[PDB]
C-alpha cells in the first residue's frame, strides 16, 4: 500500500464500499483512515478482491495468500477409459476387466 | 443536467508502463469503462512469442546438449520469455538464428540481427556453455493473439522441430483505479485511472487504443437485429 | 506408407517421432493358422489380383489414450553379443515414450493439510479474482472445506 | 425433466405401464420409418444439425410427444398380434 | 489422426435424445445409478450435476 | 533438506575443491586431493511409477565448493529442498459452483 | 426502535418502495443492501422484510411460473437454510410436480 | 471468426430478449456487464419527484375521507409513467382534484402540453363521500435513481419529496452460456433480458446504452 499512496493514487472507491461492509462485520474499527482499516484487514490476512468479470469488488474482504500445493499422481489422462466391445474371458465369455 | 466529454490525461513511462486517466465521468462509469477494457487488454491484444525450435543434432524436447548446463526443457523454457517486436506491420513470421561456443553464457542478444526485429530484452539468459560446448538454434517467432499451446499448433520447420508454447499477448499486467471527483456542482463523480504494463512489442498506449478499437468494433454487432 | 512414415528400415519408430493412438510403434509379422484363407476369403482375393498373403500384421500399436515422443529404443536380439533371452524368443524390442503433462481438468491437487481436490475449471486470467494492483490469483479454494 | 412427464404418469395406472407403451410405440416407429405417426408436420420433434433443423431421430422422444396428443390407444387384449404386425406393414411399408 | 472434424458433428446426431447412466462407487441404494442426457465436452473428466 | 539428502537423489560434494566442468550430462570437479572425480548425471530416468527421475546441475565452472555442498538437484528438489509442488497465490472464496 | 407505539426501524421509514423492482433498483444504486430491512408493497399487503427476502421470493415465483402459489410455499420472514429449502422442494413437489 | 448474429424476441412495448452469439471467449460478460450497468445508470426517463396534497403536512399522515394513507398514494404515484413528447420539455406540474365517492386514475390528471400518460388506468386513490382530494405533482426528466431525502426539491412549504424513479428500465438480467461453432468450443453466447415501463422500449433502451458506450470510446482522443 505505501508503494501506492506515493505512486500517485489514493484509496479506491470500491475499497471503501467493502470497508463499509467490513465495519458491519466487525473486522475494522470504525472512524479510522482507510489505510488504518486496510492495515487492520491485512493483519487478519484479508484483502480486497475485485471480480474480474465485472470490476466490482467482492462484497467482502477475502483471505488471500501463498500456499504449497502438490500435483498428485492421479490424473484423468491415466484413468479415462471406455469400451464398446472388446476381449472376453475363456470360460465365461464375459468381458475382460 | 448531463456531464460532458472529460479530460484524457496520458502519463507514459518508458516503452513498458502507462497510466491513463479520465476526468470526470458519471458516478459508476469508473468500472463500466475500466473493466471491459482490462478484460480485452489481457486477452485479445496481438503480440509475439516464439513458436518452434530446431537445434542441430537434436530430435525431441527431452534431449540434452553437451557442454551446455541447460537441458533442452530449460532452454525451450528460457526462450518463452524472449519478446520480439516487429517493426514492419505486414511481417507475420521470422526465423531467428544463433551460434556460439567456448565458455560463453549465451544471452538473448547473441542472436543474429535481422531488420524489422528488435530484441526487447537483450540481457535475457539463454544457455551456459563451457569450454567445448557448441550451439545452433533456429527459433521461429510469430505475431498472434492470446495463448496457443504446443499441443495445439504443432509448428515444425525442420523435421526435429520442437513446437513451443506462445504467450502471444504483450500485456504483462492491467490494473485500474477509480477515485472520487467533482465538477464543482456535483459529488460522487468517478476518476478512472488505467494502469498498463507491457513487454515492448506493442506499448501501453497502443494496447489501450487497440483495446478500445475492439470494444467499439464489438458494439457494431448490435446493428442488425432479427 | 503414411502409416509407416516414422519407422526405420527394421520396423522401429524413429527416436524423436510423435506417436498417437493407432500408430505402429514396432511392426511385426506372425504366420496365419489352419484358417489359412478359407473359401469366403480365397475368393475375395481372387478378384483383386493379390493372392492370400501368408504372414500377419501383429504390429505393436499404441493404446487408446496414450502416446507422446519416442525418446529411446532398445533392440535385443539373440545372436548379438552379451544377450540371451527366454527360450524360443528370437528378438525383443522396447520403445520408451514420453509426454509433457500440462495440468488439465481432472487432475488431483492437494496440500500438506489434507485439502485435496480435482481441478474442475480453468478460467482465463481476465476472470480470476485479483487484487487492486492488477495481480490475479492462481487458485480459488472454497472455504466450505475448512 | 422430461417434457410433460407429470401428465404422462397421470394417464397410466402404474408408472411402468407408461414405460412399455412408450417403448413399444417407440419401436413401431423405428421399424416403419415413422409413416404411421399420428403427428402433423409442425408438431414433429426436430433436432438442429450443423447444416439445418431436421426430424428428431430418437424414436422415444417421438413416442412420448406422440402419446400426449391422445391420438394413441393403450390397453391389454386389444388386437391379434399377427393382425397388427401386418395391417401396419400394409398401411405403411418397410 | 484419421478422425476428421465432421466425425464429431456426426456423433452429436447419434446421441440425440438418448441418455446414459452414471454409477458411483458404492451403489448403496436405488440411486447410485441415475439417467442423464450426455452433453459432449472436450477434456477427460465426467461432469456431475 | 535432510530428506533431499538421505533420499540419496540429489548429488553432493565429497571433499573441498573447485569445479572443473559442468554440463546437462556430467559434473567434473578437481579436488584439493588433486583427484578429478567425474559425477555423471542420471538424466531423464524412468521411475517405477513412470515419473521422470531427472537430475539437473546447480553449479557453474570454477565454482569454489566446500565439503557437503550441492552439485545437482534431484527430482522434486530445489537448491536442495524437498520441492513436492508449487507455491501459488490462493484465494479462499466460493466461486460460482466450480 | 419503538417509535410512537409499535416497534419498527429507521430503515422501514426512510425507504418505502411501491413494488419489488424499485426496491431492487435501489439496491443496484447503493441506496440499500440486501440484508437491510425496508418496506415494500408486494401483492397488496405492504410488508416489512428485506430486498434479499424479496429477491428470493421472486426467484421461486419466476422459476415455477406461478407467482400466487410461490407466495404461499416459502416462509419469507426467516433466513433460508437447509430445512426451509428442503421444505420448499417438498412443498413445491406436492403442488406443482 | 464469423459475423456474430443478433436476435431479437420482443413481446410488446415492455419486454424483449436479445441474443448475440457466437462471441470470442470471455466477451459475453465483457459486453452485457457494462450494458447492465448502463441500462440501469443512464437511461433518461421521467419520474414523480414532489407532491403536495391540500391539507397534508408530512408523509406519514392519514387523509380523512380517503381510504389510502399518504404513503400509499405516494407509492401509486411512484408507479406512474409518462413520456415527454417535446424533447425540449424538462419539467411539469400535474394537477388533479376530485372528491366524493370516486376512485381517481392517471387518466383523471389535468392534461398538459405534449405530456403523454402511458398508463391511464393506474389507480391513485379512492374517496368516500365527503373526501376531498386536491393535489399537485412534480414530474421531471432524469436518470437512474434518487432517494427523496437526497434531492430535496420543494416547490412550496408542505410539498413532500418522493423517491425519484427515473429509469424507464425495471431490471436488466443477462445470461452468458458456453456455445460452439464447428470445432471452436469456448465461445460466449449472450442472452440479455430487458424490462421497461413502456415510456421507452426494451429494444430502444439497449441501443441507447450501446450508443452511450461507444461515445466514451471517443473520450480517448486528445491527450495531455
From Swiss-Prot, chain B:
Q: Name its GO BP terms in alphabetical order.
A: DNA-templated transcription
Q: How does it assemble?
A: Homodimer. The RNAP catalytic core consists of 2 alpha, 1 beta, 1 beta' and 1 omega subunit. When a sigma factor is associated with the core the holoenzyme is formed, which can initiate transcription.
| GO CC term, one of those recorded | DNA-directed RNA polymerase complex
Function summary = DNA-dependent RNA polymerase catalyzes the transcription of DNA into RNA using the four ribonucleoside triphosphates as substrates.
Molecular function in Gene Ontology: DNA binding; DNA-directed RNA polymerase activity; protein dimerization activity
| Native organism | Thermus thermophilus
Segments of this protein annotated with the region Alpha N-terminal domain (alpha-NTD): 1-226
Provide this UniProt record's keywords sorted from A to Z: DNA-directed RNA polymerase, Nucleotidyltransferase, Transcription, Transferase
* Enzyme class of the recorded protein, top EC level: transferase
Fragment boundaries within the full protein? 4 to 229 of 315
Write down what this protein is called.
Answer: DNA-directed RNA polymerase subunit alpha
Q: Does the keyword Transferase apply?
A: yes
Q: What is known of its domains?
A: The N-terminal domain is essential for RNAP assembly and basal transcription, whereas the C-terminal domain is involved in interaction with transcriptional regulators and with upstream promoter elements.
Recall the taxonomic lineage recorded for the source organism. Answer: Bacteria, Thermotogati, Deinococcota, Deinococci, Thermales
In short, the EC number is 2.7.7.6
Keyword Transport, does the record have it?
Answer: no
State the family it belongs to.
Belongs to the RNA polymerase alpha chain family.
Q: Which reaction does it catalyse?
A: RNA(n) + a ribonucleoside 5'-triphosphate = RNA(n+1) + diphosphate
UniProtKB/Swiss-Prot annotation, chain C:
Instruction: Give the highest taxon in the source lineage.
Output: Bacteria
Q: What does the record give as the function of this protein?
A: DNA-dependent RNA polymerase catalyzes the transcription of DNA into RNA using the four ribonucleoside triphosphates as substrates.
Q: How does it assemble?
A: The RNAP catalytic core consists of 2 alpha, 1 beta, 1 beta' and 1 omega subunit. When a sigma factor is associated with the core the holoenzyme is formed, which can initiate transcription.
Can you tell me which family this protein belongs to? Belongs to the RNA polymerase beta chain family.
Q: What is this protein called?
A: DNA-directed RNA polymerase subunit beta
Q: What is the lineage of its organism?
A: Bacteria, Thermotogati, Deinococcota, Deinococci, Thermales
Name the gene behind this protein.
rpoB
Q: Which residues of the full protein are shown?
A: 731 to 876 of 1119
UniProtKB/Swiss-Prot annotation, chain E:
| Top-rank taxon, per record | Bacteria
Identify its protein family: Belongs to the RNA polymerase beta' chain family.
Subunit record text? The RNAP catalytic core consists of 2 alpha, 1 beta, 1 beta' and 1 omega subunit. When a sigma factor is associated with the core the holoenzyme is formed, which can initiate transcription.
Role this protein plays: DNA-dependent RNA polymerase catalyzes the transcription of DNA into RNA using the four ribonucleoside triphosphates as substrates.
State the name under which the record lists this protein. Answer: DNA-directed RNA polymerase subunit beta'
Organism annotation: Thermus thermophilus (strain ATCC 27634 / DSM 579 / HB8)
> Gene encoding it?
rpoC
Curated annotation (Swiss-Prot), chain H:
Annotated GO molecular function terms are:
DNA binding; DNA-directed RNA polymerase activity; protein dimerization activity
Q: Which reaction does it catalyse?
A: RNA(n) + a ribonucleoside 5'-triphosphate = RNA(n+1) + diphosphate
Name the keywords, alphabetized.
DNA-directed RNA polymerase, Nucleotidyltransferase, Transcription, Transferase
GO biological process: one example: DNA-templated transcription
UniProt entry tagged with the keyword Nucleotidyltransferase: yes
- Going by the record, the broad EC class of this enzyme is transferase
Is Transferase a UniProt keyword of this protein? yes
Q: Where is this region: Alpha N-terminal domain (alpha-NTD)?
A: 1-224
* Cellular component aspect of the GO annotation: cytoplasm; DNA-directed RNA polymerase complex
Tell me its EC number(s), please: 2.7.7.6
Query: What family does this belong to?
Result: Belongs to the RNA polymerase alpha chain family.
Q: What does this protein do?
A: DNA-dependent RNA polymerase catalyzes the transcription of DNA into RNA using the four ribonucleoside triphosphates as substrates.
Quaternary state and interactors? Homodimer. The RNAP catalytic core consists of 2 alpha, 1 beta, 1 beta' and 1 omega subunit. When a sigma factor is associated with the core the holoenzyme is formed, which can initiate transcription.
Q: What is known of its domains?
A: The N-terminal domain is essential for RNAP assembly and basal transcription, whereas the C-terminal domain is involved in interaction with transcriptional regulators and with upstream promoter elements.
Q: What's the protein here called?
A: DNA-directed RNA polymerase subunit alpha
The part of the entire sequence present here spans: 6 to 229 of 315
Amino acid at each position: 500500500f505505501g508503494k501506492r499512496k506515493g505512486e500517485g493514487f489514493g484509496v479506491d472507491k470500491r475499497e471503501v464500499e467493502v470497508l463499509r461492509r467490513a465495519e458491519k462485520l466487525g473486522l475494522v474499527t470504525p472512524g479510522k483512515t482507510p489505510e488504518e482499516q486496510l492495515k487492520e484487514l491485512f493483519l487478519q490476512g484479508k484483502v480486497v478482491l475485485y471480480d474480474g468479470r465485472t470490476g466490482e469488488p467482492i462484497e467482502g474482504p477475502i483471505v488471500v495468500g501463498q500456499m504449497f500445493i502438490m500435483k498428485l499422481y492421479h490424473m484423468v489422462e491415466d484413468k479415462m477409459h471406455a469400451r464398446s466391445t472388446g476381449p472376453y474371458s475363456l470360460i465365461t465369455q464375459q468381458p475382460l476387466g | 443536467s448531463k456531464l460532458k466529454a472529460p479530460v484524457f490525461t496520458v502519463r507514459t513511462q518508458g516503452r513498458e508502463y502507462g497510466e491513463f486517466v479520465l476526468e470526470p465521468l458519471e458516478r459508476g462509469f469508473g468500472v463500466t469503462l475500466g473493466n471491459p477494457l482490462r478484460r480485452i487488454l489481457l486477452s485479445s491484444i496481438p503480440g509475439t512469442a516464439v513458436t518452434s525450435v530446431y537445434i542441430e543434432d537434436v530430435l525431441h524436447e527431452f534431449s540434452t546438449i553437451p557442454g551446455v548446463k541447460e537441458d533442452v526443457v530449460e532452454i525451450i523454457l528460457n526462450l518463452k520469455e524472449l519478446v520480439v517486436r516487429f517493426l514492419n506491420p505486414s511481417l507475420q513470421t521470422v526465423t531467428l538464428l544463433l551460434k556460439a561456443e567456448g565458455p560463453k553464457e549465451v544471452k538473448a542478444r547473441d542472436f543474429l540481427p535481422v531488420a524489422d526485429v528488435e530484441i526487447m530484452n537483450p540481457d535475457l539468459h539463454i544457455a551456459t556453455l563451457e569450454e567445448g560446448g557448441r550451439l545452433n538454434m533456429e527459433v521461429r517467432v510469430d505475431r498472434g493473439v492470446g495463448y496457443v499451446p504446443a499441443e495445439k499448433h504443432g509448428i515444425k520447420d525442420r523435421i526435429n522441430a520442437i513446437p513451443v508454447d506462445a504467450v502471444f499477448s504483450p500485456v504483462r499486467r492491467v490494473a485500474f483505479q477509480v477515485e472520487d471527483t467533482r465538477l464543482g456542482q456535483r459529488t460522487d463523480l468517478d476518476k478512472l485511472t488505467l494502469r498498463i504494463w507491457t513487454d515492448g512489442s506493442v506499448t501501453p498506449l497502443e494496447a489501450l487504443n487497440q483495446a478500445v478499437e475492439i470494444l467499439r468494433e464489438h458494439l457494431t454487432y448490435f446493428s442488425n437485429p432479427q | 506408407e503414411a502409416a509407416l512414415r516414422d519407422l526405420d528400415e527394421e520396423g522401429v519408430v524413429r527416436i524423436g517421432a510423435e506417436v498417437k493412438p493407432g500408430d505402429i510403434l514396432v511392426g511385426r509379422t506372425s504366420f496365419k493358422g489352419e484358417s489359412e484363407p478359407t473359401p469366403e476369403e480365397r475368393l475375395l482375393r481372387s478378384i483383386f489380383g493379390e493372392k492370400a498373403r501368408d504372414v500377419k500384421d501383429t504390429s505393436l500399436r499404441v493404446p487408446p489414450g496414450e502416446g507422446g515422443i519416442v525418446v529411446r529404443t532398445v533392440r535385443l536380439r539373440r545372436g548379438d553379443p552379451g544377450v540371451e533371452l527366454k527360450p524360443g524368443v528370437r528378438e525383443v524390442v522396447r520403445v520408451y515414450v514420453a509426454q509433457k503433462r500440462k495440468l488439465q481438468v481432472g487432475d488431483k491437487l492437494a496440500n500438506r493439510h489434507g485439502n485435496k481436490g480435482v481441478v474442475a475449471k480453468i478460467l482465463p486470467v481476465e476472470d480470476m479474482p485479483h487484487l487492486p494492483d492488477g495481480t490475479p490469483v492462481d487458485v480459488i479454494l472454497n472455504p466450505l472445506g475448512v | 425433466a422430461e417434457p410433460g412427464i407429470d401428465k404422462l404418469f397421470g394417464m397410466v395406472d402404474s408408472k411402468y405401464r407408461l414405460t412399455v407403451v412408450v417403448a413399444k410405440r417407440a419401436q413401431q416407429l423405428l421399424r416403419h420409418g415413422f409413416k404411421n405417426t399420428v403427428l402433423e408436420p409442425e408438431e414433429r420433434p426436430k433436432m438442429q444439425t450443423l447444416e439445418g433443423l431436421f426430424d428428431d431421430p430418437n424414436a422415444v422422444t417421438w413416442a412420448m410427444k406422440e402419446l400426449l396428443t391422445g391420438r394413441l390407444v393403450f390397453g391389454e387384449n386389444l388386437v391379434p398380434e399377427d393382425r397388427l404386425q401386418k395391417e401396419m406393414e400394409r398401411l405403411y411399408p418397410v | 489422426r484419421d478422425i476428421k472434424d465432421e466425425v464429431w458433428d456426426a456423433l452429436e446426431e447419434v446421441i440425440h435424445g438418448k441418455v446414459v447412466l452414471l454409477n458411483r462407487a458404492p451403489t448403496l441404494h436405488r440411486l447410485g445409478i441415475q439417467a442423464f442426457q450426455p452433453v459432449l465436452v472436450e477434456g477427460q473428466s465426467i461432469q456431475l450435476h | 533438506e535432510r530428506v533431499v539428502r538421505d533420499s540419496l537423489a540429489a548429488l553432493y560434494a565429497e571433499e573441498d575443491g573447485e569445479v572443473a566442468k559442468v554440463d546437462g550430462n556430467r559434473i567434473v570437479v578437481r579436488y584439493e586431493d588433486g583427484r578429478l572425480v567425474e559425477y555423471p548425471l542420471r538424466r531423464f530416468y524412468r521411475s517405477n511409477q513412470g515419473t521422470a527421475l531427472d537430475q539437473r546441475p546447480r553449479v557453474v565452472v570454477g565454482q569454489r565448493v566446500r565439503k557437503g555442498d550441492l552439485l545437482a538437484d534431484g527430482p522434486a528438489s530445489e537448491n536442495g529442498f524437498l520441492a513436492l509442488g508449487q507455491n501459488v497465490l490462493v484465494a479462499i472464496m466460493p466461486f460460482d459452483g466450480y | 426502535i419503538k417509535v410512537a407505539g409499535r416497534e419498527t426501524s429507521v430503515g422501514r421509514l426512510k425507504y418505502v418502495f411501491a413494488n419489488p423492482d424499485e426496491a431492487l433498483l435501489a439496491v443496484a444504486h447503493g441506496i440499500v443492501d440486501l440484508q437491510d430491512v425496508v418496506t415494500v408493497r408486494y401483492m397488496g399487503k405492504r410488508l416489512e422484510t428485506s430486498p434479499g427476502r424479496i429477491l428470493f421470493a421472486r426467484i421461486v415465483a419466476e422459476a415455477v411460473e406461478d407467482e400466487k402459489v410461490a407466495w404461499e410455499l416459502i416462509q419469507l420472514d426467516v433466513p433460508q437454510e437447509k430445512n426451509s429449502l428442503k421444505d420448499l422442494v417438498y412443498q413445491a413437489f406436492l403442488r406443482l410436480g
